Design a binder for these strands. Structure first.
Ligand SMILES: [Mg+2]
Ligand SMILES: [Mg+2]
Ligand SMILES: [Mg+2]
Ligand SMILES: [Mg+2]
Ligand SMILES: [Mg+2]
Ligand SMILES: [Mg+2]
Ligand SMILES: [Mg+2]
Ligand SMILES: [Mg+2]
Ligand SMILES: [Mg+2]
Ligand SMILES: [Mg+2]
Ligand SMILES: [Mg+2]
Ligand SMILES: [Mg+2]
Ligand SMILES: [Mg+2]
Ligand SMILES: [Mg+2]
Ligand SMILES: [Mg+2]
Ligand SMILES: [Mg+2]
Ligand SMILES: [Mg+2]
Ligand SMILES: [Mg+2]
Ligand SMILES: [Mg+2]
Ligand SMILES: [Mg+2]
Ligand SMILES: [Mg+2]
Ligand SMILES: [Mg+2]
Ligand SMILES: [Mg+2]
Ligand SMILES: [Mg+2]
Ligand SMILES: [Mg+2]
Ligand SMILES: [Mg+2]
Ligand SMILES: [Mg+2]
Ligand SMILES: [Mg+2]
Ligand SMILES: [Mg+2]
Ligand SMILES: [Mg+2]
Ligand SMILES: [Mg+2]
Ligand SMILES: [Mg+2]
Ligand SMILES: [Mg+2]
Ligand SMILES: [Mg+2]
Ligand SMILES: [Mg+2]
Ligand SMILES: [Mg+2]
Ligand SMILES: [Mg+2]
Ligand SMILES: [Mg+2]
Ligand SMILES: [Mg+2]
Ligand SMILES: [Mg+2]
Ligand SMILES: [Mg+2]
Ligand SMILES: [Mg+2]
Ligand SMILES: [Mg+2]
Ligand SMILES: [Mg+2]
Ligand SMILES: [Mg+2]
Ligand SMILES: [Mg+2]
Ligand SMILES: [Mg+2]
Ligand SMILES: [Mg+2]
Ligand SMILES: [Mg+2]
Ligand SMILES: [Mg+2]
Ligand SMILES: [Mg+2]
Ligand SMILES: [Mg+2]
Ligand SMILES: [Mg+2]
Ligand SMILES: [Mg+2]
Ligand SMILES: [Mg+2]
Ligand SMILES: [Mg+2]
Ligand SMILES: [Mg+2]
Ligand SMILES: [Mg+2]
Ligand SMILES: [Mg+2]
Ligand SMILES: [Mg+2]
Ligand SMILES: [Mg+2]
Ligand SMILES: [Mg+2]
Ligand SMILES: [Mg+2]
Ligand SMILES: [Mg+2]
Ligand SMILES: [Mg+2]
Ligand SMILES: [Mg+2]
Ligand SMILES: [Mg+2]
Ligand SMILES: [Mg+2]
Ligand SMILES: [Mg+2]
Ligand SMILES: [Mg+2]
Ligand SMILES: [Mg+2]
Ligand SMILES: [Mg+2]
Ligand SMILES: [Mg+2]
Ligand SMILES: [Mg+2]
Ligand SMILES: [Mg+2]
Ligand SMILES: [Mg+2]
Ligand SMILES: [Mg+2]
Ligand SMILES: [Mg+2]
Ligand SMILES: [Mg+2]
Ligand SMILES: [Mg+2]
Ligand SMILES: [Mg+2]
Ligand SMILES: [Mg+2]
Ligand SMILES: [Mg+2]
Ligand SMILES: [Mg+2]
Ligand SMILES: [Mg+2]
Ligand SMILES: [Mg+2]
Ligand SMILES: [Mg+2]
Ligand SMILES: [Mg+2]
Ligand SMILES: [Mg+2]
Ligand SMILES: [Mg+2]
Ligand SMILES: [Mg+2]
Ligand SMILES: [Mg+2]
Ligand SMILES: [Mg+2]
Ligand SMILES: [Mg+2]
Ligand SMILES: [Mg+2]
Ligand SMILES: [Mg+2]
Ligand SMILES: [Mg+2]
Ligand SMILES: [Mg+2]
Ligand SMILES: [Mg+2]
Ligand SMILES: [Mg+2]
Ligand SMILES: [Mg+2]
Ligand SMILES: [Mg+2]
Ligand SMILES: [Mg+2]
Ligand SMILES: [Mg+2]
Ligand SMILES: [Mg+2]
Ligand SMILES: [Mg+2]
Ligand SMILES: [Mg+2]
Ligand SMILES: [Mg+2]
Ligand SMILES: [Mg+2]
Ligand SMILES: [Mg+2]
Ligand SMILES: [Mg+2]
Ligand SMILES: [Mg+2]
Ligand SMILES: [Mg+2]
Ligand SMILES: [Mg+2]
Ligand SMILES: [Mg+2]
Ligand SMILES: [Mg+2]
Ligand SMILES: [Mg+2]
Ligand SMILES: [Mg+2]
Ligand SMILES: [Mg+2]
Ligand SMILES: [Mg+2]
Ligand SMILES: [Mg+2]
Ligand SMILES: [Mg+2]
Ligand SMILES: [Mg+2]
Ligand SMILES: [Mg+2]
Ligand SMILES: [Mg+2]
Ligand SMILES: [Mg+2]
Ligand SMILES: [Mg+2]
Ligand SMILES: [Mg+2]
Ligand SMILES: [Mg+2]
Ligand SMILES: [Mg+2]
Ligand SMILES: [Mg+2]
Ligand SMILES: [Mg+2]
Ligand SMILES: [Mg+2]
Ligand SMILES: [Mg+2]
Ligand SMILES: [Mg+2]
Ligand SMILES: [Mg+2]
Ligand SMILES: [Mg+2]
Ligand SMILES: [Mg+2]
Ligand SMILES: [Mg+2]
Ligand SMILES: [Mg+2]
Ligand SMILES: [Mg+2]
Ligand SMILES: [Mg+2]
Ligand SMILES: [Mg+2]
Ligand SMILES: [Mg+2]
Ligand SMILES: [Mg+2]
Ligand SMILES: [Mg+2]
Ligand SMILES: [Mg+2]
Ligand SMILES: [Mg+2]
Ligand SMILES: [Mg+2]
Ligand SMILES: [Mg+2]
Ligand SMILES: [Mg+2]
Ligand SMILES: [Mg+2]
Ligand SMILES: [Mg+2]
Ligand SMILES: [Mg+2]
Ligand SMILES: [Mg+2]
Ligand SMILES: [Mg+2]
Ligand SMILES: [Mg+2]
Ligand SMILES: [Mg+2]
Ligand SMILES: [Mg+2]
Ligand SMILES: [Mg+2]
Ligand SMILES: [Mg+2]
Ligand SMILES: [Mg+2]
Ligand SMILES: [Mg+2]
Ligand SMILES: [Mg+2]
Ligand SMILES: [Mg+2]
Ligand SMILES: [Mg+2]
Ligand SMILES: [Mg+2]
Ligand SMILES: [Mg+2]
Ligand SMILES: [Mg+2]
Ligand SMILES: [Mg+2]
Ligand SMILES: [Mg+2]
Ligand SMILES: [Mg+2]
Ligand SMILES: [Mg+2]
Ligand SMILES: [Mg+2]
Ligand SMILES: [Mg+2]
Ligand SMILES: [Mg+2]
Ligand SMILES: [Mg+2]
Ligand SMILES: [Mg+2]
Ligand SMILES: [Mg+2]
Ligand SMILES: [Mg+2]
Ligand SMILES: [Mg+2]
Ligand SMILES: [Mg+2]
Ligand SMILES: [Mg+2]
Ligand SMILES: [Mg+2]
Ligand SMILES: [Mg+2]
Ligand SMILES: [Mg+2]
Ligand SMILES: [Mg+2]
Ligand SMILES: [Mg+2]
Ligand SMILES: [Mg+2]
Ligand SMILES: [Mg+2]
Ligand SMILES: [Mg+2]
Ligand SMILES: [Mg+2]
Ligand SMILES: [Mg+2]
Ligand SMILES: [Mg+2]
Ligand SMILES: [Mg+2]
Ligand SMILES: [Mg+2]
Ligand SMILES: [Mg+2]
Ligand SMILES: [Mg+2]
Ligand SMILES: [Mg+2]
Ligand SMILES: [Mg+2]
Ligand SMILES: [Mg+2]
Ligand SMILES: [Mg+2]
Ligand SMILES: [Mg+2]
Ligand SMILES: [Mg+2]
Ligand SMILES: [Mg+2]
Ligand SMILES: [Mg+2]
Ligand SMILES: [Mg+2]
Ligand SMILES: [Mg+2]
Ligand SMILES: [Mg+2]
Ligand SMILES: [Mg+2]
Ligand SMILES: [Mg+2]
Ligand SMILES: [Mg+2]
Ligand SMILES: [Mg+2]
Ligand SMILES: [Mg+2]
Ligand SMILES: [Mg+2]
Ligand SMILES: [Mg+2]
Ligand SMILES: [Mg+2]
Ligand SMILES: [Mg+2]
Ligand SMILES: [Mg+2]
Ligand SMILES: [Mg+2]
Ligand SMILES: [Mg+2]
Ligand SMILES: [Mg+2]
Ligand SMILES: [Mg+2]
Ligand SMILES: [Mg+2]
Ligand SMILES: [Mg+2]
Ligand SMILES: [Mg+2]
Ligand SMILES: [Mg+2]
Ligand SMILES: [Mg+2]
Ligand SMILES: [Mg+2]
Ligand SMILES: [Mg+2]
Ligand SMILES: [Mg+2]
Ligand SMILES: [Mg+2]
Ligand SMILES: [Mg+2]
Ligand SMILES: [Mg+2]
Ligand SMILES: [Mg+2]
Ligand SMILES: [Mg+2]
Ligand SMILES: [Mg+2]
Ligand SMILES: [Mg+2]
Ligand SMILES: [Mg+2]
Ligand SMILES: [Mg+2]
Ligand SMILES: [Mg+2]
Ligand SMILES: [Mg+2]
Ligand SMILES: [Mg+2]
Ligand SMILES: [Mg+2]
Ligand SMILES: [Mg+2]
Ligand SMILES: [Mg+2]
Ligand SMILES: [Mg+2]
Ligand SMILES: [Mg+2]
Ligand SMILES: [Mg+2]
Ligand SMILES: [Mg+2]
Ligand SMILES: [Mg+2]
Ligand SMILES: [Mg+2]
Ligand SMILES: [Mg+2]
Ligand SMILES: [Mg+2]
Ligand SMILES: [Mg+2]
Ligand SMILES: [Mg+2]
Ligand SMILES: [Mg+2]
Ligand SMILES: [Mg+2]
Ligand SMILES: [Mg+2]
Ligand SMILES: [Mg+2]
Ligand SMILES: [Mg+2]
Ligand SMILES: [Mg+2]
Ligand SMILES: [Mg+2]
Ligand SMILES: [Mg+2]
Ligand SMILES: [Mg+2]
Lengths: 275, 48
RNA sequence: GAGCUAGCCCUGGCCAGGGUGAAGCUGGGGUGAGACCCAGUGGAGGCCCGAACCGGUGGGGGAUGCAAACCCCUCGGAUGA
RNA sequence: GAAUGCCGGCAUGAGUAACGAUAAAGAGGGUGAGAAUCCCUCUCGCCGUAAGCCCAAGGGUUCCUACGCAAUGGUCGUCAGCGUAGGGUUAGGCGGGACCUAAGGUGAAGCCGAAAGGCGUAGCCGAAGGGCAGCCGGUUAAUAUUCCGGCCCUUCCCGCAGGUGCGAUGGGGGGACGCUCUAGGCUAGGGGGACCGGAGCCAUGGACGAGCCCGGCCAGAAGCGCAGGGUGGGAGGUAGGCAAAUCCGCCUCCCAACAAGCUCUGCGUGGUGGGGAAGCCCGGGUGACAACCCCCCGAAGCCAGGGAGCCAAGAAAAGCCUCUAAGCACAACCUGCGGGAACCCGUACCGCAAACCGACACAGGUGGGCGGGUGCAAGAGCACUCAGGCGCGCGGGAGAACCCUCGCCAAGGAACUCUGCAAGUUGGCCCCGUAACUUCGGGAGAAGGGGUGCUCCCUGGGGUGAUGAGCCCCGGGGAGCCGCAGUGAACAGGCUCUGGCGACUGUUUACCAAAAACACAGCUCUCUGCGAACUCGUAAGAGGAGGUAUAGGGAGCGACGCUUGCCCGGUGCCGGAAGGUCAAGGGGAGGGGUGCAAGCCCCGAACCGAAGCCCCGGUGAACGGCGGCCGUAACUAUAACGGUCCUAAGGUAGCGAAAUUCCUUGUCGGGUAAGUUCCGACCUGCACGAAAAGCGUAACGACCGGAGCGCUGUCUCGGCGAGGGACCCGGUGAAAUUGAACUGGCCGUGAAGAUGCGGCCUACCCGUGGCAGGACGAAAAGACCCCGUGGAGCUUUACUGCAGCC
RNA sequence: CGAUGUCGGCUCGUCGCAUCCUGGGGCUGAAGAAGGUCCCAAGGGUUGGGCUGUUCGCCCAUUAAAGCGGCACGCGAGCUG
RNA sequence: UGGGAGAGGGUGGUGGAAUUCCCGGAGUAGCGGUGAAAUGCGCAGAUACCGGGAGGAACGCCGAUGGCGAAGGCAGCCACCUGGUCCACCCGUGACGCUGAGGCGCGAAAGCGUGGGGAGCAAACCGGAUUAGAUACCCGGGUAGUCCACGCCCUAAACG
RNA sequence: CCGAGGGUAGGGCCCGUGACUGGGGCGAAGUCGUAACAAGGUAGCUGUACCGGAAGGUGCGGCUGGAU
């Protein structure tokens, strides 16, 4: 659920905040945080390479365990559910009976004080991680690796999941969050359940001030600029686009497909996205 | 009103100084040039 | 050449005083249970008034200037992008 | 002899403007060749959240003293930030380094680039962040947390004593963190005292008095006290913290837990060391054996790493503690104590400024800390005033016009004008009261009105004490008094109705535009399956992102409400293994040159051979587009209806003389005595229209219209007054401009607007204050316009290339 | 074109006369009073407001009358903008 | 107290037929549609047939004139949670009852808001025919919607 | 002191009136089509929604007060 405000300022009329209800711990594990090096969009040359970034709240990066096959068979207790400013989903602190402490992204329905575990043998329960060839067809999954032992890459954002669809040889067929049908190697790991905090999408930032808190500087339309700046620049008065809608770099930006056609993964992608 | 020259000894030494020029091809040419011309000071005087 | 200016990054600092009184919390009323209503508490907000600080609205002066952008009066923001 | 030539020199303007804040001066006494200007005294004014003090930058001797006055100083100068000389800056504890890391920079390994060079995990460098041991007083012409005095402390080395498995660049803990609000107790700071100390005063009508005036503290080891911060203890198990581990983590059992204890800082106290006023006698002496006590106020500072709430979720590394590993366990480490040792650089002075940035001793700009008192509701606001600092480095007169800034005004009251521009009015606080409309918050300080000083009397609660007195805070009710007037000075909204545009707070053309422009939450399209797309780079490498489709890029639109119609023929984009066209290459029928030859060499057809284009289809919150004629109804008028040409299709809803309407001041209605503007309607809309969004919309606006009330020197229509200039005398003394000048009017003429030509008229010579009609006055080799086979920015289905992509 | 500042307004005027008013006249389809039309005449006079940047013009209330033109569409080293 | 029947309601699971799309096979000259046609689809390989896969909605026979509920209304099968109602015994209470202005709750469809889903169907819309014309009835397409959740709307030939 | 009332300011209700605009009633001697009554030539009616010169059409669900 999401929290509304009484309209006691013009911005509070629409602003909505996450209820933060599943949160049980307001501080991060000191051993699992390291400083997030803010870029502002600048690359190693000092040049802006992603526009309109910077000036958001300071953040510490919480180290996330995107492998899990690290610790096959060693169960852990869900010790807490925490806020992570570096991503949309929440994070759960796991205390491994090993004594080690690790963060995973919190699935939907994870309950503090529950057991989870990883391996070929794990039961098919929310929070457990297994290679795909041992998750039953139809079960919804998240934190899916793309290649064996290279780390979880798909279905990591709030509310998202991927669905096992069927086995073919060494591979499984998934429906990714985007509706894409893709093969993924069966030995790739994955974690049963969907990612939590599904109400993330219903947040209403409410004011220009909020975007700024997030490191998002104001976006300025090409239609607002001059010919030296943008294809849509200039015109006396307001002007329609007067050419096919283009990016600041000239390429067209309504419909032009941009994936590389000769990419080797085309062999593994079965059906392009829906919607 | 706030003007253009805002003296600052660290900034001065670190931008125009001897070790700054010596680290780049352009900087050494400045020194080769200013030595060939006979300048009394190859580099701005910074109090340090 | 970014010791002016623009943006970002790292690390510090500053914002008198007053006003408004959101959620929540307690009590009470209410109901089968509730929604909800009243009171107290509470102290929210690109909230209000106004110095510092940041601006530069309108008029006047200045115009070989005090000044190659200043001066006076008035005026905007002032916990926030 | 001319190049608005170049360099230099000297004129003109001219004894003219000006001498840099309108905070302000007067006299006496010294010094001296010389005095408005230097020094000293008295009087006066100005600052006092500074115009006082401290600190960091920056400046670099400007500091102090003697001696000077040519120049510098907007005058003067005997003075000085000026000339000459001499002197002056003292640290284990203050700041930086012999410590740590942040962005960033550099860079073993490694990667990349024609060269030069670009990157790059480790490491190193890098501070105003972390860390770390000094406080009070005195002293010099000039330095002081540095010298000295008193009282504390830190590290290193060596030695002694006790103690312990000692030992690290390695493991762990800690260091270690946001914003807003805030409790308790303290301190800084302050106010009062009828109490303590004090040189003296009694004026001019009264007063020898709870009289006046002055002051009544500072630092301090251990110990103790008060208030706080931090931390559970034991046992056992252990596969994790890239070795080890007794440490840390994880499980379990026992006891203790909001306590206590252990540890840590604050504050008080404290042996001891200091300070010590007014007044008056030449910075010094005395006051004085100074007193050094009580009550109230009270932090934003301290205890601190406190507490609570919230979402935007808030550095690192070392010092420190613990663990062990090699090793070493006659060593080593810890604890106490003692002796020794303790380096380098800075330290003067200015520092909101005459010493810094602005060419100047320049009304400008410059980061942090202290910033007293009284009154006004509060305050860093305002007035005055302490301490402290100033009167702004030209003066003296005069009392015109004119200018600036300021004050008032009879009757009228926006008649002013493009516009109430400007200036009035209003103005704080307390109480009463408050409309349409609304997104239910608002609109709202709406509007409008009442109160406001002082005296006496009764009285309610709170803070501190003790429950009381005293002090201080917040009230209440009566009865009176004065004046033109009680926020009696200063600081402090004019209000309303209605329309346009933009939802809103924000942002902008530094230095002519602050807006209706940009941004903005939000809406939609669209790309991207992760070595993502996209962006920077030749590349390596980076960003995106230590993110993963609830994500990231691109584009338009711009809160919210109700909505967003038709056209896919052209262009774009997407889909389409057919067909058509298609490059190198493949293929080699056939043809040629040459040789006696085998052979060498050259041309060359069908056929095979990609993307692209052509072809088929899809697609509008993709580029874009959205008709013309004739006829017809009980009068006319008009046409629901029929017809016809054209188109890819002919503009829907809603709005419309509009930020769009040419004709136009359309017509009608409203307001007005009168309304090219304004509002409300109509609709033949020159030339609206639905995300270059359409129509509305509460709130908001230094936006731009229109109207009214209040009030006014805006005006009728002007007057007077004030100060600073203008004027006169003394001092200093520019500027642009200038062919030379002995430089009048008219009517003519002249390259067509003549002081300079003709004719006539008028006119003794030379200045000072004023005014601006002329000298086609000055300034700038016209920005407009054109010309030049001049330039540069921008665009595209101009040409031709290139990167990029296929 | 090595610059002759451009609309309107305000201020200050001055001039022409083809005269708006006032003075003097002739003719009248001039009874009177009021007009019409032409002649003489430039001495003086020629209002205040609403609208619009406006010139001009309409409109309101008056008036003896609310004249038309020139002076670089008079006047920006006089102001406005 | 002991029993009964039932598509009453709520939640969560899962079963099969069929439609559509996509993949492979095979095959060729039309299919589809109507009163008759045409648009449309089809040699770029359709329809018909075989296998594989995805997805949504609705549940054939049982099913009846039946059953249930206050009404709206409820229909595959399984479980959980839960409502009303009938019978038999005649055990308990002792008129505790009937109605019901206001109030409160429920309330088909369509419609609304936020999100999701989207096979079939189908307002609007586009084309074909029919027709004197045909903004209709018929045909080929097609967006909301129809479905899920939560919140509204409160209507009806909500009828016996 | 109270006080008729007068003055300022802001509200509530009602009546008359208004450029223009919305439908309604009546008039009929017009134009257009033919929606309903027969199976009214697409059975009708219905709530709602979208649409069309007009009556009206269609979708969704409902009623029979529908001929065969
Ligand atoms: Mg939740
Ligand atoms: Mg809200
Ligand atoms: Mg709220
Ligand atoms: Mg709310
Ligand atoms: Mg709002
Ligand atoms: Mg919340
Ligand atoms: Mg949560
Ligand atoms: Mg760390
Ligand atoms: Mg990181
Ligand atoms: Mg990075
Ligand atoms: Mg770098
Ligand atoms: Mg570089
Ligand atoms: Mg940059
Ligand atoms: Mg970018
Ligand atoms: Mg950026
Ligand atoms: Mg951020
Ligand atoms: Mg989160
Ligand atoms: Mg969220
Ligand atoms: Mg949103
Ligand atoms: Mg955005
Ligand atoms: Mg934008
Ligand atoms: Mg622009
Ligand atoms: Mg550029
Ligand atoms: Mg270009
Ligand atoms: Mg371009
Ligand atoms: Mg353009
Ligand atoms: Mg244009
Ligand atoms: Mg433009
Ligand atoms: Mg235009
Ligand atoms: Mg523009
Ligand atoms: Mg534009
Ligand atoms: Mg615009
Ligand atoms: Mg254009
Ligand atoms: Mg366009
Ligand atoms: Mg175009
Ligand atoms: Mg792949
Ligand atoms: Mg600076
Ligand atoms: Mg300097
Ligand atoms: Mg420096
Ligand atoms: Mg620097
Ligand atoms: Mg250097
Ligand atoms: Mg030199
Ligand atoms: Mg030399
Ligand atoms: Mg140099
Ligand atoms: Mg910081
Ligand atoms: Mg502030
Ligand atoms: Mg309150
Ligand atoms: Mg609370
Ligand atoms: Mg504010
Ligand atoms: Mg405010
Ligand atoms: Mg400024
Ligand atoms: Mg200004
Ligand atoms: Mg003004
Ligand atoms: Mg003025
Ligand atoms: Mg001026
Ligand atoms: Mg100027
Ligand atoms: Mg000023
Ligand atoms: Mg000022
Ligand atoms: Mg002001
Ligand atoms: Mg303010
Ligand atoms: Mg404030
Ligand atoms: Mg505020
Ligand atoms: Mg603000
Ligand atoms: Mg010559
Ligand atoms: Mg010259
Ligand atoms: Mg010259
Ligand atoms: Mg010359
Ligand atoms: Mg010269
Ligand atoms: Mg001469
Ligand atoms: Mg002169
Ligand atoms: Mg001067
Ligand atoms: Mg001057
Ligand atoms: Mg003054
Ligand atoms: Mg004077
Ligand atoms: Mg003198
Ligand atoms: Mg003298
Ligand atoms: Mg003196
Ligand atoms: Mg003061
Ligand atoms: Mg200097
Ligand atoms: Mg000194
Ligand atoms: Mg000196
Ligand atoms: Mg001198
Ligand atoms: Mg001299
Ligand atoms: Mg001399
Ligand atoms: Mg001088
Ligand atoms: Mg000077
Ligand atoms: Mg002398
Ligand atoms: Mg001096
Ligand atoms: Mg000396
Ligand atoms: Mg010392
Ligand atoms: Mg050393
Ligand atoms: Mg280091
Ligand atoms: Mg440091
Ligand atoms: Mg000294
Ligand atoms: Mg000490
Ligand atoms: Mg020990
Ligand atoms: Mg040890
Ligand atoms: Mg260690
Ligand atoms: Mg941390
Ligand atoms: Mg920090
Ligand atoms: Mg804040
Ligand atoms: Mg006080
Ligand atoms: Mg205490
Ligand atoms: Mg172990
Ligand atoms: Mg003394
Ligand atoms: Mg003595
Ligand atoms: Mg004594
Ligand atoms: Mg404060
Ligand atoms: Mg805390
Ligand atoms: Mg959040
Ligand atoms: Mg934190
Ligand atoms: Mg770090
Ligand atoms: Mg050993
Ligand atoms: Mg050394
Ligand atoms: Mg030294
Ligand atoms: Mg010193
Ligand atoms: Mg000074
Ligand atoms: Mg200043
Ligand atoms: Mg300062
Ligand atoms: Mg100087
Ligand atoms: Mg200057
Ligand atoms: Mg200069
Ligand atoms: Mg001076
Ligand atoms: Mg100055
Ligand atoms: Mg003080
Ligand atoms: Mg006051
Ligand atoms: Mg006050
Ligand atoms: Mg103030
Ligand atoms: Mg005082
Ligand atoms: Mg003075
Ligand atoms: Mg002066
Ligand atoms: Mg005079
Ligand atoms: Mg008057
Ligand atoms: Mg008036
Ligand atoms: Mg009046
Ligand atoms: Mg006005
Ligand atoms: Mg006033
Ligand atoms: Mg006032
Ligand atoms: Mg009203
Ligand atoms: Mg008021
Ligand atoms: Mg208002
Ligand atoms: Mg009095
Ligand atoms: Mg007074
Ligand atoms: Mg004053
Ligand atoms: Mg005010
Ligand atoms: Mg209004
Ligand atoms: Mg608008
Ligand atoms: Mg705007
Ligand atoms: Mg705005
Ligand atoms: Mg709006
Ligand atoms: Mg805005
Ligand atoms: Mg603001
Ligand atoms: Mg802008
Ligand atoms: Mg500009
Ligand atoms: Mg500007
Ligand atoms: Mg400029
Ligand atoms: Mg400029
Ligand atoms: Mg501007
Ligand atoms: Mg503005
Ligand atoms: Mg904008
Ligand atoms: Mg929108
Ligand atoms: Mg590039
Ligand atoms: Mg890279
Ligand atoms: Mg990256
Ligand atoms: Mg990265
Ligand atoms: Mg990402
Ligand atoms: Mg907006
Ligand atoms: Mg915008
Ligand atoms: Mg509305
Ligand atoms: Mg149409
Ligand atoms: Mg098209
Ligand atoms: Mg097309
Ligand atoms: Mg085109
Ligand atoms: Mg082909
Ligand atoms: Mg051959
Ligand atoms: Mg659309
Ligand atoms: Mg077109
Ligand atoms: Mg378009
Ligand atoms: Mg049109
Ligand atoms: Mg119109
Ligand atoms: Mg309009
Ligand atoms: Mg138009
Ligand atoms: Mg026109
Ligand atoms: Mg017009
Ligand atoms: Mg016009
Ligand atoms: Mg008109
Ligand atoms: Mg009227
Ligand atoms: Mg107007
Ligand atoms: Mg018309
Ligand atoms: Mg338009
Ligand atoms: Mg546009
Ligand atoms: Mg527009
Ligand atoms: Mg509001
Ligand atoms: Mg505004
Ligand atoms: Mg504005
Ligand atoms: Mg006047
Ligand atoms: Mg006077
Ligand atoms: Mg005067
Ligand atoms: Mg005077
Ligand atoms: Mg005067
Ligand atoms: Mg001569
Ligand atoms: Mg001439
Ligand atoms: Mg002439
Ligand atoms: Mg003459
Ligand atoms: Mg001559
Ligand atoms: Mg002659
Ligand atoms: Mg002559
Ligand atoms: Mg004459
Ligand atoms: Mg003149
Ligand atoms: Mg003059
Ligand atoms: Mg002239
Ligand atoms: Mg002349
Ligand atoms: Mg002239
Ligand atoms: Mg002239
Ligand atoms: Mg000039
Ligand atoms: Mg030239
Ligand atoms: Mg020229
Ligand atoms: Mg020219
Ligand atoms: Mg020029
Ligand atoms: Mg021309
Ligand atoms: Mg040519
Ligand atoms: Mg030529
Ligand atoms: Mg060019
Ligand atoms: Mg590309
Ligand atoms: Mg010219
Ligand atoms: Mg010239
Ligand atoms: Mg000129
Ligand atoms: Mg008669
Ligand atoms: Mg005659
Ligand atoms: Mg006359
Ligand atoms: Mg005359
Ligand atoms: Mg006019
Ligand atoms: Mg004219
Ligand atoms: Mg006109
Ligand atoms: Mg007219
Ligand atoms: Mg009359
Ligand atoms: Mg008359
Ligand atoms: Mg004229
Ligand atoms: Mg003319
Ligand atoms: Mg003309
Ligand atoms: Mg003229
Ligand atoms: Mg003129
Ligand atoms: Mg002018
Ligand atoms: Mg003019
Ligand atoms: Mg003149
Ligand atoms: Mg004007
Ligand atoms: Mg203008
Ligand atoms: Mg049946
Ligand atoms: Mg019985
Ligand atoms: Mg009822
Ligand atoms: Mg319903
Ligand atoms: Mg429904
Ligand atoms: Mg609906
Ligand atoms: Mg579908
Ligand atoms: Mg027809
Ligand atoms: Mg629709
Ligand atoms: Mg919809
Ligand atoms: Mg029935
Ligand atoms: Mg009366
Ligand atoms: Mg019919
Ligand atoms: Mg029918
Ligand atoms: Mg029908
Ligand atoms: Mg029609
Ligand atoms: Mg239809
Ligand atoms: Mg029914």
């Amino acid at each position: 659920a999401v929290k509304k405000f009484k309209p006691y300022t013009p911005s509070r009329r629409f602003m909505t905040v996450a209820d933060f209800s599943e949160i049980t711990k307001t501080e991060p594990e000191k051993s699992l945080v390291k400083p997030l090096k803010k870029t502002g969009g600048r690359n190693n040359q000092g040049r802006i390479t992603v526009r309109f970034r910077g000036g958001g709240h300071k953040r510490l990066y919480r180290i996330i365990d995107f492998k899990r096959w690290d610790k096959v068979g060693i169960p852990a207790k869900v010790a807490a559910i925490e806020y992570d400013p570096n991503r949309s989903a929440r994070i759960a602190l796991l205390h491994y009976v090993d004594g080690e402490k690790r963060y995973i992204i919190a699935p939907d329905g994870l309950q503090v004080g529950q057991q989870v575990v990883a391996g070929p043998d794990a039961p098919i329960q929310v929070g457990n991680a297994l290679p795909l060839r041992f998750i039953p067809v139809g079960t919804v999954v998240h934190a899916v690796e793309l290649e064996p032992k290279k780390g979880a890459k798909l279905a990591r954002a709030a509310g998202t999941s991927a669905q096992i669809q069927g086995r073919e040889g060494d591979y499984v067929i998934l429906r990714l969050p985007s509706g894409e049908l893709r093969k993924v190697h069966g030995e790739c790991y994955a974690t049963v359940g969907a990612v939590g905090n599904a109400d993330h999408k219903n947040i209403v930032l409410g004011k220009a001030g909020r975007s700024r808190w997030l490191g998002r500087r104001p976006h300025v339309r090409g239609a607002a600029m001059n010919p030296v700046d943008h294809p849509h620049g200039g015109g006396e008065g307001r002007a329609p686009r007067g050419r096919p809608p283009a990016s600041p770099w000239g390429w067209q930006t309504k419909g032009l497909k941009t994936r590389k056609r000769r990419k080797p993964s085309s062999r593994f992608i079965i059906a392009r996205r829906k919607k | 009103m706030k003007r253009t020259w805002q003296p600052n000894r660290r900034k001065r030494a670190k931008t125009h100084g001897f070790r700054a020029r010596m680290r780049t091809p352009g900087g050494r040419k400045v020194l080769k040039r200013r030595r060939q011309k006979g300048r009394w000071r190859l580099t701005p005087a910074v109090r340090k």
